[PDB]
Amino acid sequence: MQNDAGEFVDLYVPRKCSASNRIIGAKDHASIQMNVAEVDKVTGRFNGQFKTYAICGAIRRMGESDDSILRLAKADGIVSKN
Amino acid sequence: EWMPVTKLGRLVKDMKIKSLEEIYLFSLPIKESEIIDFFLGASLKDEVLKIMPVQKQTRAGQRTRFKAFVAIGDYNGHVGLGVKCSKEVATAIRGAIILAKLSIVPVRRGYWGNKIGKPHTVPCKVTGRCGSVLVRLIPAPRGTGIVSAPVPKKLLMMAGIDDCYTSARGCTATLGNFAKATFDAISKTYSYLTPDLWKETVFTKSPYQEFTDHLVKT
Amino acid sequence: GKCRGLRTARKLRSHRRDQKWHDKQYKKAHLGTALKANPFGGASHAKGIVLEKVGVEAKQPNSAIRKCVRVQLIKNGKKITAFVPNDGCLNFIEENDEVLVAGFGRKGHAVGDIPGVRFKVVKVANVSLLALYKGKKERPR
Amino acid sequence: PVARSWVCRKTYVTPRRPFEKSRLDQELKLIGEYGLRNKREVWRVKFTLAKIRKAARELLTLDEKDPRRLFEGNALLRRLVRIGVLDEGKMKLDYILGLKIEDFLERRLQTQVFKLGLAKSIHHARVLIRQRHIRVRKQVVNIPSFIVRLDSQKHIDFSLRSPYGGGRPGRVKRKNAKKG
Amino acid sequence: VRMNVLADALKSINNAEKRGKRQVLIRPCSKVIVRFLTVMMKHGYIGEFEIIDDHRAGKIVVNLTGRLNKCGVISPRFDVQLKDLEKWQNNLLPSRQFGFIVLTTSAGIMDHEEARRKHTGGKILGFFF
Amino acid sequence: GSLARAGKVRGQTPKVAKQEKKKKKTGRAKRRMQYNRRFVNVVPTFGKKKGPNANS
Amino acid sequence: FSEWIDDLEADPKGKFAQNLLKKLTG
RNA sequence: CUUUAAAUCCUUUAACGAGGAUCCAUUGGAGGGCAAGUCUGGUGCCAGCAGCCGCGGUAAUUCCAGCUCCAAUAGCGUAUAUUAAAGUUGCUGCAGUUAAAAAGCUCGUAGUUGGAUCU
């Protein structure tokens, strides 16, 4: 990213899988970026906010996208404990 | 006149996407070459790596088609490779140019030693593989140029790599596999997790979500 | 697999040294049978006396008569067949004259159509075949 | 035993690929731009640049505070800025790696007496130097490949015995004036 | 039989990181394994780990952060001088901007940069990047 | 396998005498001429990149 | 231009095959 | 003149010395590898070329020539030996199901290798 002078010399900063932290490639068409709507705690309705989770195509192929997304939602308070 | 067929094409034509990098950030498949013409179609140079006549045996003769292997890319940070087979050489070259445009990937450039100036080489040693052909790119000091065979040299120059060491193993005489292996090595540059990419990703709004209203209303 | 141990230097070197003998080039260049069977005796050129003119038939795909000469080397009295390269160059050669003969370029291997011919005539009667060919020099009288 | 010294070295390197079209065009462009005689002069300047780059790399792989790196890098940079190839403001080892072959070709005496207006072209510059019309300081220099130092740039005159700088007419002028 | 428990540990870590797992179990543990893991951790490559004490030889549960490309052992433990360190770096490391060669020196187990800083050679244990 | 025909084609080739032309440049001038022909003007090109010895 | 392309498609494996394929781009 | 033990050479000075500036650059090539002509004439699986693939049997981009063209250049071709190419000897760094290849099978000495642990 940074040269000696400190300016950023990259074309872009690729995003990383929220499950494995590995970089999602430019031609990884099996990768998803899913938004989970946030809900007002009293009315239980869509407040316009959401949590964004990026999952690479490898995890989805392994069948671990379900577990990874469930765990990401649980750590965000979306999913009830247990 | 380009009439988009996909949502991404509509967003690019309507000037909703401001660069190829937003498309790359979300790994969206580019299915219209007019997107690449919009974003880079003032610096893209094409080059036919090879015309290969292939033959299919039939009852009363060999049916001969020609496969055009064409490399493309502005000589800064972007390169693509396209292989198209057709009964006519000109049609094969046209299809190969379109396919090379469709496969253009961003090239990550780094520094060999100290970081004065712009990046000039590969960020690290990368390896691409295609049918027993292994192509290794190794960072080189500034001013050494591309130390490679002509076939990978063409792609490395079109990728904007100023200098790079290379190694090849296998049957590199098959130009198609050689080119595809060096293209894989080049495309793996941005998929490599280096310590400068350990910073947590700040997710942004995808083009289909950030301009969903525009797509609906247009 | 191979032995990777700090005290395996002797075994590795011995294995390399034995396995080098299975390389055709190494065994050829380090046995002496090839050197002793080489008509030139390890030299690059050799002088010989033309014993007769022969016409060697090209290999099966081609059809021609390559003009060669049977020459007996002065150094060892060994008889070899030397190709006379250009056209009309067999006319420059006469029987029982001295010819300087080099290899055919493939290091003891036959070259092209000419079967079993690994030598070519370079000089005849102390004048190069190329100088006679282009009229630069004429045969000594 | 002889007092003779056998020390010599080849000052160029022949390219590995003899018929690379891009390399041929680049070398021909250099030859035409700087008025060189053959490819061997391009290869010679290339060899000098390559040796300088190799020395710079070897010094760069050293520890920064290593005394040999300081001493030899300082000497190399001093020489490069002495011959004008390297700018005095750019005096780091990694700035050596960014030098081109045209940087060294510009410092040739041929290029300098073409640039200083002494000759009408670069080939006129070559024939002027080869014909002993150009002097550096007080020395009549006859070699077009003579690499001009920065402190020697300001003294490239037209000689004191040349018909262009000393006013003794040449053979042709005198012979023609005799018939007139 | 089992030899070079460090080789087995690093192979387990590498195979777990390839699989995307957040944790890996290493058994048996050792002082060399713990020191290598600590050198790995100070550079942020693996993160925290726990030593389970069974009364014959330890086990280690290493939390995995997906920052690790390759961790490898160099067998045999070649003795490396400061001069050969650059050649080893060129051979084993993907770049001069990152990647560490781990050596055991008389000053302890440390990466190649710290070995140069302390001006010492040693025996190469492995590498990680 | 007869050697009777040895200088057949060279012997029977109708002899043609080489013409007389002005001497080619040598050394730096020849390289200057090549550089001029190949890099100074685009007169000898067509946009199709024809060859130096094109007889078409 | 397309002359080489066209004469190549007449004899893909003829005498003038490597020449024309090279003349296309090399 | 200078040089040097006489000398020669280089350097220096003067005289003569250049318009086909005839004071005339060559050596290999022009199908691909590999840069440069499917131009013309001759020959017609002949003569020959061709490291390799191949060209030649009446329209030869490949022989023999003329012309033109390019490669290096006061040099260039050839043979042999050798190094890199060769990760085709592989320590780095190769292979061993079917392409060449794991001993028919165990035991076994030397050899090689050898679990944790002590501030």
Side-chain angles (χ1 to χ4, degrees):
Chain A
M1 329 270 251
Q2 292 203 264
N3 52 349
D4 270 349
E7 43 181 350
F8 288 68
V9 290
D10 263 25
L11 256 182
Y12 78 114
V13 174
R15 54 202 223 289
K16 308 199 279 282
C17 187
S18 305
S20 60
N21 162 287
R22 306 305 289 182
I23 282 196
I24 299 172
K27 310 267 142 205
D28 192 3
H29 305 321
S31 68
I32 59 111
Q33 209 201 256
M34 167 129 73
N35 307 338
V36 179
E38 268 280 38
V39 136
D40 194 18
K41 47 206 298 223
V42 54
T43 88
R45 263 153 56 160
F46 184 36
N47 52 11
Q49 312 210 39
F50 43 68
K51 300 314 224 314
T52 307
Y53 303 143
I55 308 288
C56 72
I59 305 299
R60 294 188 62 216
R61 263 173 268 285
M62 311 174 42
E64 313 286 350
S65 50
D66 156 40
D67 211 72
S68 272
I69 274 150
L70 169 65
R71 137 169 74 251
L72 287 155
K74 208 166 315 153
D76 265 320
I78 306 285
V79 158
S80 309
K81 317 133 55 152
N82 289 43
Chain B
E1 206 47 53
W2 171 34
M3 305 262 287
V5 188
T6 44
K7 307 211 308 262
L8 180 63
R10 268 260 60 107
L11 292 177
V12 168
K13 163 107 159 190
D14 294 42
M15 317 231 294
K16 286 320 152 134
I17 319 300
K18 280 300 156 155
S19 186
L20 208 29
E21 278 50 67
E22 304 68 41
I23 310 173
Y24 287 148
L25 183 61
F26 298 95
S27 312
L28 313 174
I30 294 152
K31 319 241 211 203
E32 305 171 45
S33 68
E34 289 89 356
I35 297 184
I36 306 292
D37 298 359
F38 192 104
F39 282 125
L40 308 157
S43 37
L44 287 174
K45 311 269 133 60
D46 49 347
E47 145 92 11
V48 181
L49 301 172
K50 200 184 185 171
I51 304 283
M52 197 171 114
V54 286
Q55 319 215 102
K56 184 193 173 281
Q57 189 80 286
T58 337
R59 182 169 271 289
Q62 314 149 355
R63 200 257 290 111
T64 289
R65 275 155 23 199
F66 310 83
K67 211 153 53 135
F69 308 76
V70 168
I72 209 199
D74 59 333
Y75 290 62
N76 161 308
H78 294 103
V79 71
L81 176 71
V83 192
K84 179 103 195 77
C85 179
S86 71
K87 323 150 181 243
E88 286 91 23
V89 174
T91 313
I93 299 173
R94 225 173 300 129
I97 289 162
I98 296 298
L99 284 192
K101 282 180 181 171
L102 265 39
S103 76
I104 276 191
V105 294
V107 183
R108 191 168 181 226
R109 260 149 323 151
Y111 300 91
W112 168 79
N114 264 17
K115 309 218 210 66
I116 316 82
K118 337 198 270 163
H120 61 105
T121 181
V122 282
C124 53
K125 299 172 182 174
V126 279
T127 292
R129 285 206 101 274
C130 193
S132 99
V133 183
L134 168 143
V135 177
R136 190 194 210 197
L137 317 176
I138 297 116
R142 192 174 300 262
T144 58
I146 307 288
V147 186
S148 82
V151 185
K153 176 175 294 186
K154 257 159 261 291
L155 278 142
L156 284 154
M157 285 191 339
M158 281 156 129
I161 312 281
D162 282 286
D163 40 282
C164 199
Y165 293 126
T166 74
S167 171
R169 143 153 267 202
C171 187
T172 68
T174 71
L175 184 141
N177 279 10
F178 205 5
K180 280 148 126 277
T182 170
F183 187 61
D184 190 10
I186 287 166
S187 51
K188 275 151 146 254
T189 45
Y190 253 120
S191 298
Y192 204 101
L193 183 58
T194 62
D196 41 30
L197 302 159
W198 289 358
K199 177 184 301 319
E200 290 229 25
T201 141
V202 174
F203 294 118
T204 282
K205 285 186 130 301
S206 41
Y208 301 159
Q209 166 178 36
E210 140 188 38
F211 316 97
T212 171
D213 281 332
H214 173 81
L215 294 163
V216 176
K217 78 191 305 179
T218 317
Chain C
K2 45 164 72 152
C3 35
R4 293 194 279 250
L6 224 47
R7 270 89 83 111
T8 55
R10 177 183 276 111
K11 162 75 158 220
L12 287 176
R13 177 188 28 156
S14 321
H15 189 252
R16 181 48 53 230
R17 149 157 41 86
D18 315 343
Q19 283 315 285
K20 256 180 289 167
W21 284 110
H22 286 101
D23 186 9
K24 290 203 336 153
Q25 264 102 328
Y26 179 94
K27 183 146 204 190
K28 190 102 154 273
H30 287 90
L31 253 204
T33 69
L35 203 291
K36 106 166 73 153
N38 192 349
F40 282 7
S44 55
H45 299 65
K47 267 178 237 209
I49 308 285
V50 182
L51 306 171
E52 48 143 344
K53 307 177 169 181
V54 297
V56 184
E57 304 260 86
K59 272 169 151 66
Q60 211 169 319
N62 282 343
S63 211
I65 293 140
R66 316 292 177 205
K67 320 304 165 162
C68 307
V69 281
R70 293 282 289 171
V71 347
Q72 195 183 28
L73 304 183
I74 292 136
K75 75 189 321 179
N76 50 32
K78 281 183 186 165
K79 298 185 171 84
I80 55 138
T81 304
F83 179 56
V84 192
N86 277 307
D87 90 322
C89 268
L90 190 79
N91 298 347
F92 293 130
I93 297 176
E94 286 316 297
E95 292 248 31
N96 268 42
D97 70 28
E98 193 176 18
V99 283
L100 180 89
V101 172
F104 219 162
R106 278 190 76 183
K107 289 91 191 156
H109 200 296
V111 171
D113 293 342
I114 332 190
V117 166
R118 28 201 63 82
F119 307 103
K120 54 152 143 174
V121 176
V122 165
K123 287 201 200 184
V124 47
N126 202 139
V127 171
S128 56
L129 263 183
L130 169 140
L132 295 167
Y133 189 71
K134 315 203 189 228
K136 293 151 153 315
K137 296 225 220 130
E138 301 149 290
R139 216 185 185 266
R141 292 100 183 185
Chain D
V2 285
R4 316 238 215 25
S5 139
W6 312 287
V7 193
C8 57
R9 93 189 23 212
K10 191 171 287 215
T11 51
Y12 75 102
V13 164
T14 281
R16 174 183 310 199
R17 304 190 183 261
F19 304 119
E20 174 171 337
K21 195 85 227 150
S22 40
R23 200 205 74 249
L24 298 170
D25 299 23
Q26 192 217 317
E27 297 167 326
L28 190 55
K29 276 160 123 288
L30 290 161
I31 279 177
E33 160 131 8
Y34 292 102
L36 311 178
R37 168 173 29 123
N38 42 18
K39 304 272 166 151
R40 220 207 331 265
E41 312 200 310
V42 176
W43 302 340
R44 164 177 71 193
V45 186
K46 271 195 39 133
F47 194 39
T48 75
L49 209 230
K51 285 194 290 191
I52 290 170
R53 290 190 80 249
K54 174 178 167 172
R57 298 201 38 190
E58 167 257 329
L59 292 167
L60 273 160
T61 66
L62 258 47
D63 169 29
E64 203 310 328
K65 286 82 207 170
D66 168 300
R68 200 193 56 171
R69 166 164 173 169
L70 279 315
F71 194 74
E72 299 202 350
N74 223 22
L76 182 43
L77 297 159
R78 208 265 327 191
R79 283 196 309 274
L80 294 181
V81 313
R82 182 183 194 204
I83 75 193
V85 166
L86 197 45
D87 174 44
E88 310 65 341
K90 297 295 172 301
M91 269 218 63
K92 309 271 160 233
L93 269 184
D94 40 71
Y95 282 143
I96 296 179
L97 296 181
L99 298 167
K100 267 38 181 213
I101 191 192
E102 289 113 326
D103 305 346
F104 291 85
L105 291 166
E106 274 272 338
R107 310 298 316 145
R108 279 169 57 104
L109 188 71
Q110 209 195 328
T111 314
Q112 279 331 292
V113 321
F114 170 53
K115 285 335 176 44
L116 298 170
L118 292 191
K120 323 235 188 60
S121 66
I122 197 80
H123 309 269
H124 186 223
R126 188 138 189 152
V127 308
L128 270 187
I129 291 163
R130 201 71 218 147
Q131 285 164 359
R132 301 156 58 94
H133 295 296
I134 310 293
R135 72 181 164 124
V136 169
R137 289 195 211 71
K138 260 193 255 181
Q139 166 68 58
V140 167
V141 177
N142 182 33
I143 311 294
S145 57
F146 180 98
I147 299 291
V148 185
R149 291 156 182 178
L150 277 187
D151 40 286
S152 153
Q153 177 112 58
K154 302 269 162 285
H155 320 88
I156 292 181
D157 205 4
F158 218 153
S159 210
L160 317 156
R161 316 217 73 224
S162 194
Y164 309 129
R168 203 263 179 140
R171 173 213 326 188
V172 166
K173 220 178 190 178
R174 270 145 33 199
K175 188 173 186 192
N176 288 356
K178 268 329 271 172
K179 330 189 181 207
Chain E
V1 298
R2 169 190 259 118
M3 308 141 162
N4 209 353
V5 299
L6 180 69
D8 279 347
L10 291 178
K11 252 302 189 295
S12 311
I13 300 160
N14 199 54
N15 284 1
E17 271 264 15
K18 285 154 149 269
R19 287 298 271 150
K21 307 189 171 302
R22 333 200 47 71
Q23 267 158 310
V24 66
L25 176 90
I26 293 161
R27 67 105 213 168
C29 106
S30 88
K31 286 186 309 190
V32 172
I33 284 168
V34 170
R35 277 329 209 300
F36 203 106
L37 281 185
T38 308
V39 168
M40 258 179 137
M41 218 177 39
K42 312 309 270 303
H43 298 291
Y45 272 80
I46 52 142
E48 307 190 68
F49 58 94
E50 193 148 322
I51 305 172
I52 292 98
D53 171 20
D54 195 358
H55 270 163
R56 52 271 294 160
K59 308 185 174 169
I60 310 191
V61 164
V62 185
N63 298 97
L64 293 178
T65 67
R67 289 150 141 166
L68 190 60
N69 281 300
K70 182 109 207 300
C71 49
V73 76
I74 301 296
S75 199
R77 269 158 214 200
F78 292 112
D79 40 317
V80 186
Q81 318 192 349
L82 282 168
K83 330 198 324 302
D84 330 328
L85 201 43
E86 196 83 8
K87 281 165 224 133
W88 276 104
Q89 292 169 193
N90 295 335
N91 287 334
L92 298 182
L93 296 184
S95 207
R96 304 175 98 243
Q97 318 287 5
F98 65 98
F100 296 100
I101 291 179
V102 187
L103 311 111
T104 180
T105 86
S106 331
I109 278 157
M110 40 199 199
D111 41 296
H112 65 279
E113 262 161 359
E114 180 187 345
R116 276 185 192 292
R117 252 184 282 123
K118 306 231 202 163
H119 202 72
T120 180
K123 301 174 165 326
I124 179 172
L125 298 169
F127 60 92
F128 64 93
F129 56 89
Chain F
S2 211
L3 318 134
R5 337 166 276 275
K8 175 192 170 300
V9 164
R10 198 172 191 240
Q12 79 204 164
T13 293
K15 157 95 175 182
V16 185
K18 318 174 106 303
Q19 324 165 333
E20 256 85 20
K21 43 263 205 185
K22 69 181 323 159
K23 71 179 204 205
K24 329 200 202 83
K25 291 328 196 32
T26 22
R28 184 216 66 247
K30 174 176 179 180
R31 293 283 193 198
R32 162 194 214 175
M33 187 250 312
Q34 296 176 319
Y35 168 81
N36 281 327
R37 285 217 278 190
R38 291 174 206 184
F39 295 123
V40 171
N41 320 81
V42 297
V43 195
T45 188
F46 296 97
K48 317 301 169 171
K49 298 319 178 278
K50 253 198 190 203
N53 204 4
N55 298 121
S56 43
Chain G
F1 194 17
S2 52
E3 161 193 67
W4 314 327
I5 278 153
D6 290 321
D7 308 1
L8 164 80
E9 296 185 44
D11 263 9
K13 297 207 298 174
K15 188 170 154 188
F16 315 84
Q18 277 157 340
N19 196 274
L20 269 75
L21 286 164
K22 146 89 206 192
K23 231 196 279 290
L24 297 189
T25 16

